[PDB]
Amino acid sequence: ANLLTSLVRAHLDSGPSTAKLDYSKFQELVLPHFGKEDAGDVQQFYDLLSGSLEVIRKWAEKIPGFAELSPADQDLLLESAFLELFILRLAYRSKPGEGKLIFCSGLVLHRLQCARGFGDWIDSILAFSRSLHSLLVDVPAFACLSALVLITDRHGLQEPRRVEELQNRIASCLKEHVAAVAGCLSRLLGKLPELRTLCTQGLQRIFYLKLEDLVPPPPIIDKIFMDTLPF
Amino acid sequence: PANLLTSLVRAHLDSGPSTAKLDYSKFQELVKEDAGDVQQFYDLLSGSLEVIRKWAEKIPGFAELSPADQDLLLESAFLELFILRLAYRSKPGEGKLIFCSGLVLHRLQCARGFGDWIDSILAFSRSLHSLLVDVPAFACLSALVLITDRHGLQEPRRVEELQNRIASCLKEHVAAVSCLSRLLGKLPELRTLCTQGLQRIFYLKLEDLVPPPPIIDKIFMDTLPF
Numbered sequence: 393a394n395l396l397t398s399l400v401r402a403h404l405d406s407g408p409s410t411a412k413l414d415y416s417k418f419q420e421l422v423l424p425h426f427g428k429e430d431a432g433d434v435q436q437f438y439d440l441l442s443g444s445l446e447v448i449r450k451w452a453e454k455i456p457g458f459a460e461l462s463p464a465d466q467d468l469l470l471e472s473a474f475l476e477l478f479i480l481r482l483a484y485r486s487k488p489g490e491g492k493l494i495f496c497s498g499l500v501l502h503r504l505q506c507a508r509g510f511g512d513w514i515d516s517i518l519a520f521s522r523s524l525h526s527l528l529v530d531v532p533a534f535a536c537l538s539a540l541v542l543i544t545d546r547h548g549l550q551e552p553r554r555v556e557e558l559q560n561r562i563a564s565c566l567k568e569h570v571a572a573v574a575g576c577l578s579r580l581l582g583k584l585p586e587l588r589t590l591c592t593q594g595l596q597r598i599f600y601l602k603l604e605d606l607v608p609p610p611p612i613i614d615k616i617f618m619d620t621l622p623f
Numbered sequence: 624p625a626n627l628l629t630s631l632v633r634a635h636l637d638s639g640p641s642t643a644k645l646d647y648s649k650f651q652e653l654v655k656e657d658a659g660d661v662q663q664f665y666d667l668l669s670g671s672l673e674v675i676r677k678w679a680e681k682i683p684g685f686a687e688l689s690p691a692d693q694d695l696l697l698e699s700a701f702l703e704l705f706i707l708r709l710a711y712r713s714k715p716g717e718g719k720l721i722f723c724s725g726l727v728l729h730r731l732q733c734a735r736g737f738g739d740w741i742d743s744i745l746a747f748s749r750s751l752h753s754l755l756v757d758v759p760a761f762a763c764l765s766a767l768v769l770i771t772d773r774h775g776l777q778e779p780r781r782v783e784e785l786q787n788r789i790a791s792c793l794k795e796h797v798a799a800v801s802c803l804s805r806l807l808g809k810l811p812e813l814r815t816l817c818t819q820g821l822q823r824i825f826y827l828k829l830e831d832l833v834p835p836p837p838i839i840d841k842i843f844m845d846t847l848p849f
């Protein structure tokens with residue numbers, strides 16, 4: 393289909409091919425002091441977050457109908473879904489059988505290289521990679537599901553009906569694609585609790601790093617952090 | 624001063640339960656969080672609020688500080704005062720937590736409310752116990768946690784003068800009986816444990832099964848350096 397083709401184009405252009413996988417910082421072993429971190433670790437944590445948000449903004453821009461939402465509805469959807477999309481995309485593209493995290497830049501980093509910046513959270517994101525990989529979700533389904541994570545009801549949308557209409561079109565597009573392959577949706581929804589838990593772990597880690605204030609969080613991440621806290 | 628050590632010991636012993644008023648009625652020797660675990664966590668924290676205030680006012684010098692500095696020192700030090708008094712009063716050997724009301728509980732009857740933090744608190748307690756810290760040494764230690772430099776003090780010189788009097792009183796007692804610096808060594812380990820408390824309240828405010836009571840919330844909000 394034309395919506396599916398567009399969703400798949402956007403997904404594939406928002407990450408790296410096997411070709412431009414960047415091993416310039418990958419180390420199979422490092423010997424970290426666990427349960428602590430330095431300014432360098434925290435800056436990279438924040439840079440990987442910033443890089444993913446930049447890339448998720450350009451992917452959302454290429455979903456048909458999204459660019460025509462009000463600027464504020466675009467922002468609200470992007471902030472509300474950022475953390476959930478960062479985890480879901482990082483989980484889908486990573487190699488947990490080799491302890492490999494693959495960020496959207498093409499940067500590859502060992503579990504142990506992420507431990508200082510991310511803490512426990514990255515162990516859990518790798519656990520979810522295995523969980524996700526076991527469901528054998530093809531690229532076109534994932535391309536739809538990531539968009540359904542973004543284009544969803546949120547408190548404070550100016551045009552909630554336009555967002556629901558676009559939700560309808562994308563849900564319909566996915567149904568068509570699982571019909572075309574049939575000639576797993578109950579099971580996928582089974583994972584939504586681990587994923588909500590991983591979003592909470594993310595907020596826990598930003599809170600901790602803000603408490604420690606080795607380096608301040610980037611303005612745009614700090615706003616997502618603050619705007620997400622129901623209090 | 625002299626009579627200062629004695630004043631500090633009297634404050635400490637009057638702030639805690641007489642070995643008589645110890646209450647085992649709710650103690651279970653064999654046993655995520657729901658609302659009752661969160662309510663209990665907030666109740667256990669809240670029970671120390673008035674007791675730590677009454678203790679502070681009985682520290683010679685403390686009522687001589689500006690009212691704003693008093694409130695600031697109390698608020699800044701609450702979590703650490705809670706952890707250290709609990710650590711000292713509790714029997715980690717047996718996983719027995721003893722609250723300043725006399726309530727006695729096993730770690731597994733609080734673990735769901737406190738999370739991981741209770742194991743850290745109990746780890747700290749075993750370590751505190753190892754030093755065999757005598758009541759007078761502890762009477763000054765706890766005061767040193769309260770009477771310490773904080774951001775936003777009106778009279779930081781005066782707060783620092785009071786601290787030095789209390790450290791002098793401690794050093795003298797500890798000499799009159801590397802030990803000193805292993806007592807003082809517990810103050811910064813207490814700050815690291817403070818942080819886990821803030822992490823736990825942050826998490827509970829996110830989950831929001833029950834809201835923190837306003838005085839805890841205020842202490843939470845006022846102790847975030849951002």
Ligand SMILES: CCCCCCCCN(C)C(=O)c1cc(O)c(O)c(O)c1
Nearest residue numbers: 473476537540541542544580581583584
């Ligand atoms: C691996 C499982 C993820 C697949 C996406 C399924 C939910 C998408 N839909 C339809 C939503 O309305 C939605 C629901 C949410 O709980 C949510 O946080 C959100 O951002 C959007």
